[PDB]
Amino acid sequence: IENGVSMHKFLTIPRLEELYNTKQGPTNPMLFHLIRDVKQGNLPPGYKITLIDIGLVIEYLMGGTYRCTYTRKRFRLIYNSL
Amino acid sequence: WQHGEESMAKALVACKIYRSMAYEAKQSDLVDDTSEELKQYSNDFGQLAVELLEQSFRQDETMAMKLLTYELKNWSNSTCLKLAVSSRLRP
Amino acid sequence: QKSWIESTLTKRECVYIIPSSKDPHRCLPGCQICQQLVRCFCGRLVKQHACFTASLAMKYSDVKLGEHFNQAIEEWSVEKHTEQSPTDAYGVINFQGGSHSYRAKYVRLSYDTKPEIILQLLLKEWQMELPKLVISVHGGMQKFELHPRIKQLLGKGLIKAAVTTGAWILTGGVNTGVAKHVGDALKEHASRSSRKICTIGIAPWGVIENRNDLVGRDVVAPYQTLLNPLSKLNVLNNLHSHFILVDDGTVGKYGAEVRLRRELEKTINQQRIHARIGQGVPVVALIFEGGPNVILTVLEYLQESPPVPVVVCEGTGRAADLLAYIHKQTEEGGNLPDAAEPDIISTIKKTFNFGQSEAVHLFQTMMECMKKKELITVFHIGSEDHQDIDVAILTALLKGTNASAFDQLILTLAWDRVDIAKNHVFVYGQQWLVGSLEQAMLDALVMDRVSFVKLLIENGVSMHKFLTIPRLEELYNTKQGPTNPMLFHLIRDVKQGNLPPGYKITLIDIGLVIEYLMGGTYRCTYTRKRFRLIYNSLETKRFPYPLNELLIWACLMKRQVMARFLWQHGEESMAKALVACKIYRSMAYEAKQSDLVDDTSEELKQYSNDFGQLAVELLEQSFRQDETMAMKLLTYELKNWSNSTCLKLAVSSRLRPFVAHTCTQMLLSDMWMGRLNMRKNSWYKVILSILVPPAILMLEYKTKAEMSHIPQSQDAHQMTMELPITRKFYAFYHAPIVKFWFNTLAYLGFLMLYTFVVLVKMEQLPSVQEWIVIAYIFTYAIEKVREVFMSEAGKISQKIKVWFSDYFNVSDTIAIISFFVGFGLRFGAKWNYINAYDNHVFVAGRLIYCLNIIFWYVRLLDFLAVNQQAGPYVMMIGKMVANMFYIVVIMALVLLSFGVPRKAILYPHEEPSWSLAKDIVFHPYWMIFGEVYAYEIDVCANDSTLPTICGPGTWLTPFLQAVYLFVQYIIMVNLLIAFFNNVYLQVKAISNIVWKYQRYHFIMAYHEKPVLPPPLIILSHIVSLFCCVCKGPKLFLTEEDQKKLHDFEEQCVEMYFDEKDDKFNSGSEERIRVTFERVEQMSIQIKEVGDRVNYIKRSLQSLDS
Amino acid sequence: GDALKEHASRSSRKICTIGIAPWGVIENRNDLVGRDVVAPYQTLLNPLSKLNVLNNLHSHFILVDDGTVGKYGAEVRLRRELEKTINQQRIH
Ligand SMILES: CCCCCCCC/C=C/CCCCCCCC(=O)O[C@@H](COC(=O)CCCCCCCCCCCCCCC)COP(=O)([O-])OCC[N+](C)(C)C
Ligand SMILES: CCCCCCCC/C=C/CCCCCCCC(=O)O[C@@H](COC(=O)CCCCCCCCCCCCCCC)COP(=O)([O-])OCC[N+](C)(C)C
Ligand SMILES: CCCCCCCC/C=C/CCCCCCCC(=O)O[C@@H](COC(=O)CCCCCCCCCCCCCCC)COP(=O)([O-])OCC[N+](C)(C)C
Ligand SMILES: CCCCCCCC/C=C/CCCCCCCC(=O)O[C@@H](COC(=O)CCCCCCCCCCCCCCC)COP(=O)([O-])OCC[N+](C)(C)C
Ligand SMILES: CCCCCCCC/C=C/CCCCCCCC(=O)O[C@@H](COC(=O)CCCCCCCCCCCCCCC)COP(=O)([O-])OCC[N+](C)(C)C
Ligand SMILES: CCCCCCCC/C=C\CCCCCCCC(=O)O[C@@H](COC(=O)CCCCCCCCCCCCCCC)COP(=O)([O-])OCC[N+](C)(C)C
Ligand SMILES: CCCCCCCC/C=C\CCCCCCCC(=O)O[C@@H](COC(=O)CCCCCCCCCCCCCCC)COP(=O)([O-])OCC[N+](C)(C)C
Ligand SMILES: CCCCCCCC/C=C\CCCCCCCC(=O)O[C@@H](COC(=O)CCCCCCCCCCCCCCC)COP(=O)([O-])OCC[N+](C)(C)C
Ligand SMILES: CCCCCCCC/C=C\CCCCCCCC(=O)O[C@@H](COC(=O)CCCCCCCCCCCCCCC)COP(=O)([O-])OCC[N+](C)(C)C
Ligand SMILES: N#Cc1ccc(COC[C@H]2O[C@@H](n3c(NCc4ccc(Cl)c(Cl)c4)nc4c(N)ncnc43)[C@H](O)[C@@H]2O)cc1
Ligand SMILES: C[C@@H]1CC[C@@]2(OC1)O[C@H]1C[C@H]3[C@@H]4CC=C5C[C@@H](OCCC(CO)CO)CC[C@]5(C)[C@H]4CC[C@]3(C)[C@H]1[C@@H]2C
Ligand SMILES: CC(C)CCC[C@@H](C)[C@H]1CC[C@H]2[C@@H]3CC=C4C[C@@H](O)CC[C@]4(C)[C@H]3CC[C@]12C
Secondary structure, X not given: OOOOOOOOOOOOHHHHHHHHOOOOOOOOHHHHHXXXXXXXXXXXXXXXXXXHHHHHHHHHHHOOOOOOOOOOHHHHHHXXXX | OOOOOOHHHHHHHHHHHHHXXXXXXXXXXXXXXXXXXXXXXXXXXXXXXXXXXXXXXXXXXXXXXHHOOOOOOOOOOOOHHHHHHHOOOOO | OOOHHHHHOEOOEOOOOOEOOOOOOOOOOHHHHHHHHOEEOOOOEHHHHOOHHHHHHHOOOOOOOOOOOOOOOOOOOOOOOOEOOEOOEEXXXXXXXXXXXXXEEEEEEEOOOOHXXXXXXXXXXXXXXXXXXXXXXXXXXXXXXXXXXXXXXXXHHHHHHHHOOOOEEEEOOEOOOHHHHHHHHHHHOOOOOOOOOEEEEEEEHHXXXXXXXXXXXXEEEOOEOOOOOOOOOEOEOOOOOEEEEEEOOOOOOOOOOHHHHHHHHHHHHOOEEEOOEEEEOOEEEEEOOOOHHHHHHHHHHHHOOOOOOEEEOEOOOHHHHHHHHHHHOOOOOOOOOOOOHHHHHHHHHHHOOOOOOHHHHHHHHHHHHHHOOOOEEOOEOOOOHHHOOHHHHHHHOOOOOOOOHHXXXXXXHHHOOHHHHHHHHOOOOOOOOOOHHHHHHHHHHHOOOHHHHHHHHHOOOOOOOOOOHHHHHHHHOOOOOOOOHHHHHHHHHHOOOOOOOOOOOOHHHHHHHHHXXXXXXXXXXXXXXXXXXXXXXXXXXXXXXHHHOHHHHHHHOOOHHHHHHHHOOOOOHHHHHHHHHHHHHHHHHHHHHOOOOOOOHHHHHHHHHHHHHHHHHHHHHHHHHOHXXXXXXXXXXXXXXXXXXXHHHHHHOOOHHHHOOOOHHHHHHHHHHOOEOOOOOOHHHHHHHHHOHXXXXXOOEOOOOOOOOOOEOHXXXXXXXXOOHHHHHHHHHXXXXXXXXXXXXXXXXXXXXXHHHHHOOOOOOOOHHHHHHHHHHHHHHHHHHHHHHOOOOOOHHHHHHHHOOOXXXXXXXXXXXXXXXXXHHHHOOOOOOOOOOOOHHHHHHHHHHHHHHHHHHHOHHHHHOOOOOHHHHXXXXXXXXXXXXXXXXXXXXXXXXXXXXXXXXXXXXXXXXOHHHHHOOHHHHHHHHOOOOOOOOOOOOOOOOOHHHOOOOHHHHHHHHHHHHHHHHHHHHHHHHHHHHOOHHHHHHHHHHHHHHHHHHHHHHHHHOOOOOOOOXXXXXXXXXXXXXXXXXXXXXXXXXXXXXXXXXXXXXHHHHHHHHHHHHOOHHHHHHHHHHHHHHHHHHHHHHHHHHHHHHHHHHHXXX | OHHHHHOOOOOOOOOOOEXXXXXXXXXXXXXXXXXXXXXXXXXXXXXXXXXXXXXXXXXXEEEEOOOOOOOOOOOHHHHHHHHHHHHOOOOO
């Protein structure tokens, strides 16, 4: 960042979607569990995580009427574009 | 956290994420607990927010009270009080 | 348009077109290649214009039919062939990358702008404050490098010189020249640091990358530091806070910045540096490299009118290395030493190779620079030049520019830099004039620069000469500095509600404020006949004690740093600190109560408590030196503070740590004695000497010398001149210790009677015991009316408001009024003669006595509280009843939660009756105190005392009561035991302090009391009214003791400040850091000397071969 | 007199610094006239002055009245004779 990296340019969907789907680093076994809960109990074997699914975790973790930007119409629309 | 803006808001969301992860991790019987680690992570961000509010408050008490109550627009139109209350963050 | 920028500032765009020079690039189809590549002599090619008029000419082949008479090709004139319009690019850069997202402002103006409009932009539009210095850095035009030695030091001082003086740094802005390393200096040494430097960068729009990104109206720009290798232009540097981007209409070429920049320098040097000062914002030029354009610029400035000095930095690049070089080999003004033409042109030929004609031309340009050697500074970073470039940049404006020592000082004053003024304006052998120093003081006072007020007093300013009426009257009437909105409000109050619009404050009006703020009988020197007389007249206007008058000014203006400074200069140090505590304390009270603006009362009370602590810390210093003279300091009349007293001023401000200091308590103990020496007597002998008067002659007294520190009445002091017999009786009965016991024996014999009267039958007429009691309570009440009238302060409603601010004076009013209601009903009733108590009026009077008696026992706590130990416990009881209040409100709720179900379950068949109010509250209260009512629980039991109360639902009451007492005792009584035990220590500590404070009012009340107690006091009244119609204590000092006492106070303020520093300078934290800050410097000097020995070894091999 | 300044001549222990000068060469002679009078004396080094200013940090002064004014000289006798008059005193 100091030597000239703009995180606005480096934060596309596939990248930030890739960042969740990494075993090349310190990972959380808690996250894949949280995803199984919000997904009605199912987990397909491959299952590259998506951002609409992270949204359901945060909405579950923040509780109440919290609604993440990953579950909105604007994002769900452009998500299917990319 | 210290890069970007909305610093208290990001610290009070973070306290609530870990706090909920700790609760689920404790209650959920999946592997070894890891809940003592997440609550400390929560209380670390919850302390940052307080230490900022003290900083804001000593500068201008009127604008600091505005910081508590402005709609966020990036955090579901919530509020820094509402996020601290959401995490039972009493200080 | 809703924008001054849009309405006023203008862009530029080459509406006309002029093709590039001649050449088609390659590629046979001449017509295609023309429109494809060919640049305008504007600077942009045909397809970039878009120039709607020219667009319908782009189609034809372009604007301007062909060959066009080569005169007319070059007839490109920015004034003729380029057009203005409401600008497009003004907003906020949002530098992406780096860290923190540093955020700057920009604008795209035309070079056709008038110079004033730019100053209108920086200040009014961009909301900037006018600086006190401008640093115009010229130097490298192309990206270069500095030794990390030479880099960081220029980034120490170019910052520090710009922080302190609130300076603007005018760069090129583009990240290729000096702006890079200027911009880096912002980085390492924390340009924010809670104090941002307003760094500006002026560049031309035609040469900067990402022009499109900065287009838009008030738009945040996603600008980034992307140094593309394929880019040809420069990047805007990050750490510059502002940018001005001239729109020359062209693109690609440099050049259209140097006009505006120099004209901005003029436009700032034509601004008043500060409303109080009559100079202009000075300008200095700084250099880090240079080609021909730079050293030519250096020549311009030295030639300008006013001349702008120059600071060159040896060791930074082509020019600056040379400009120090040619300048070092020069003499006074204008020379090269006899044989230097060959050497210096070779340096030119090597350092910047043009070659043997342009060298000599620019060499002649270097001559005319070295002619004005006096304005140029050659700070060389090698060893120790001009003491750390801060000094050099700031002192450079204090060089041969013909500015007298006044003009030299006042500029360092605006900058708020004394180190410059000390080391470079008060240099040995300076030519100071008569009023220059005094005038600079008047500026430092109003601008609130204490450090120059110190400096000017040290360097020969007598505040007795500089404190006339108009000056000190002007000082109140200033907006050129930190002012107090509270003062003009205080003036409106004392002026009956009026305020004429102009209203230059006067000193008779400040006097009315102080008299209002100090209260009581304070009378300032500004309202007296001597001052009011000479005031209308204006040697005789010089204020013999000025620093008593500027201490008040500093405090009425809420200027603490000035107050504490002006406090420690002069004399009467405690007195000035205790007045100051009272001024602020009253200002805080008025500011709190008065609903004028935001409160500011938390600020004033701390200012009060700051001076109130100084006085205590001095009294401790005095007391540890000499306890006898310190007690004199408490009680001498002041003669500059309304003939008041340091105790009286501390009491006036309720300043308990001074009244509870062990010196006042040691004095109050010595006034309690009187002439008696109760060190070598005992209370057995004082009491016996009251009942046996001739035993007054066989107990020891004090001489006139032990009574020298003790204030006295006039009569009491006259009788120390002579110890005869009739002086030993006066000395005894007029001692406060004697008046006390002589009143306790009368008061104890009062209750014994009044107890007897109340326990024994009372017939129609009062017994002898009861008449003696009415005599006491009557004569005792006359004593209290006397206390109110002779209280302190002539304002009647204050005599009353202060007397009812005391517990035992309010209860006496109730106890005395109740008694004569009782005597009236008792005495003035139609007695029955068959049986008393057939008269309900005689009953009432008697029962008032039986309750009035309670007031007169509790009053024994006023007499028991004279003791060391008893007193504080007495004073605790009130503080503790106040603090237990809410535990007891809960205990009363638990009571009614129980009493109402109990009464309702057990007694259903009740009509409305006031007994219901009792029975819900009566037994549940007595349960708190050990009464279980064991045989009223379970009323249906065999052992019951209420078997008739047995009925439906009465089995619920033992459950209810089990819960009740659990809550009372096991929770609420032990919570209260816990309360007290965990609050005892701090209530006991406050209560010692409050007792020691009330001990002033108690003892000083007894100098005023008559001798005889309140049955025989009427004699002392009749004697006083007989001696009032027919015809307090002071500390009398001779002239040689007022002398030796002021010497004592001065000596103790010395020891105070000395010991306060010696404690600090000898502490651990202060020795670790001076140790730390020298291992800084030594570590640098070892590697320095560690570098020198590396340059000593080279000589060994050199002299070897 | 400056050495008194920097290194805290008071320091709770004042040095009894004496300065013997002649009265005829000192500025503000009139200001120092009077009987047991506190003098409003100041350090005003007027450029148009020709005489010397009494230094501040000296605790005492002996100003010989030679009868004349303007000339130096009438101090060296007393000073040396004071040295004798002290060296003829028992040190303790
Ligand atoms: C024979 C039997 C008959 C009677 C039986 C029953 C007797 C009942 C017994 C009652 C107890 C009697 C003692 C009361 C003690 C008061 C405490 C006190 O002084 O507090 C404060 C009073 O501050 C004031 O300013 C007071 C001014 C008015 C006087 C108080 C009226 C109370 C009257 C009650 C009449 C009850 C009499 C009922 C009968 C008609 C202390 O002062 P302060 O706080 O510093 O205030 C000054 C400064 N300030 C204003 C800025 C704050
Ligand atoms: C600094 C402030 C603190 C000090 C405060 C000092 C001020 C204190 C204020 C005190 C005044 C309080 C009121 C007094 C009594 C009147 C009310 C009353 O009950 O009257 C009764 C007596 O009526 C009479 O005619 C007989 C009165 C005899 C004189 C006693 C009161 C005067 C003394 C006052 C000396 C005070 C001055 C003290 C020295 C200054 C009326 O009832 P009755 O007639 O008996 O019966 C009627 C019905 N029956 C006939 C059917 C039975
Ligand atoms: C069910 C029964 C419930 C209650 C029952 C009893 C409790 C009722 C209690 C009422 C007191 C209310 C006052 C609260 C304290 C205020 C602070 C204070 O210091 O006040 C005063 C002192 O303190 C007193 O005057 C306390 C008096 C009561 C203590 C016990 C009396 C013992 C004697 C009676 C024995 C008789 C026994 C037999 C009688 C027949 C004076 O202070 P001030 O001048 O006002 O200044 C304010 C302080 N400030 C400046 C810091 C703000
Ligand atoms: C959440 C916290 C838990 C609390 C703890 C548990 C709570 C305790 C629970 C106790 C159990 C209840 C005892 C009563 C049983 C029934 C009584 C009955 O039938 O007959 C009796 C009626 O007597 C009454 O109706 C009185 C009710 C009992 C009052 C108990 C108060 C609690 C004191 C203790 C509290 C501390 C407990 C200490 C715990 C170790 C009498 O018999 P009878 O035939 O009707 O009449 C015979 C005629 N005669 C009356 C003329 C002789
Ligand atoms: C710790 C160990 C304790 C032992 C535990 C064993 C428990 C055994 C339970 C026994 C209850 C049943 C026995 C009585 C049967 C009904 C008839 C009767 O005699 O009624 C009697 C009242 O008493 C009642 O009516 C019942 C009382 C119920 C509450 C008992 C406590 C509950 C447990 C604890 C929870 C408490 C809550 C605690 C909250 C913190 C009426 O008799 P009397 O009063 O003499 O009046 C007769 C005359 N009359 C007709 C004129 C009115
Ligand atoms: C205000 C301040 C004054 C100063 C005080 C000193 C001066 C005051 C001194 C004296 C004035 C009183 C005169 C006495 C008259 C004698 C007759 C008498 O009383 O006989 C009684 C016996 O009892 C006594 O004789 C003692 C009565 C007083 C008891 C309290 C004295 C202690 C205080 C003072 C001394 C210690 C001092 C302690 C402190 C160091 C008999 O009772 P009776 O009521 O007479 O009979 C009628 C009964 N009937 C109504 C039921 C029908
Ligand atoms: C500010 C002070 C002033 C207070 C106000 C003034 C007070 C003066 C008030 C009144 C004076 C006049 C008294 C007579 C009243 C008319 C009734 C009457 O005459 O007879 C009746 C008395 O009835 C009663 O109620 C007597 C008791 C009332 C006094 C109340 C005092 C309390 C004041 C607060 C305490 C002070 C605390 C002050 C602390 C600040 C009946 O009695 P009788 O005549 O013998 O007839 C027998 C009847 N029988 C046939 C049924 C058997
Ligand atoms: C007629 C025959 C002749 C004899 C009669 C006389 C008999 C004797 C009379 C009284 C008893 C006490 C006598 C001893 C005094 C000792 C001296 C002393 O130190 O005094 C102290 C106490 O001063 C007082 O006044 C204390 C209260 C006593 C008078 C009122 C009674 C209150 C208590 C009633 C309770 C009711 C209990 C109910 C029980 C029934 C004052 O001096 P200090 O402490 O040095 O000051 C310290 C402060 N300093 C350090 C800042 C300087
Ligand atoms: C819950 C804990 C464990 C207990 C469980 C078991 C108990 C459950 C609860 C309650 C039991 C109620 C029945 C017991 C009475 C039987 C005997 C009787 O008749 O007694 C009396 C009536 O008593 C009544 O009429 C009872 C009133 C209704 C109950 C109200 C709730 C009280 C408890 C709070 C709610 C519960 C929760 C409280 C939470 C701690 C006697 O009246 P009588 O018959 O007219 O007598 C003739 C009178 N004569 C001769 C004078 C004419
Ligand atoms: N020497 C000496 C000396 C002699 C007597 C005293 C007693 O002082 C009396 C005054 O003390 C005052 N006072 C008191 N009085 C104590 C008291 C008064 C009455 C009762 Cl019934 C009780 Cl339970 C206790 N408490 C105070 C407090 N908490 N804060 C401020 N002032 C207080 C009150 O105005 C009262 O008039 C103090 C010192
Ligand atoms: C928040 C707290 C809740 C509890 C409580 O405080 C506030 O609520 C209050 C209401 C009071 C009652 C109001 C009116 C009457 C009528 C009167 O009728 C005279 C009849 C006859 C005489 O014989 C006339 O001749 C008798 C007294 C009674 C019942 C009061 C009793 C006390 C009560 C219960 C008080 C109690 C302490
Ligand atoms: C409600 C009325 C009609 C009946 C009597 C009320 C009771 C509570 C009154 C009558 C006498 C009163 C006392 C009279 C005198 C004093 C001394 C004072 O320093 C504190 C209050 C205190 C201790 C009073 C407390 C309240 C009191 C006890």
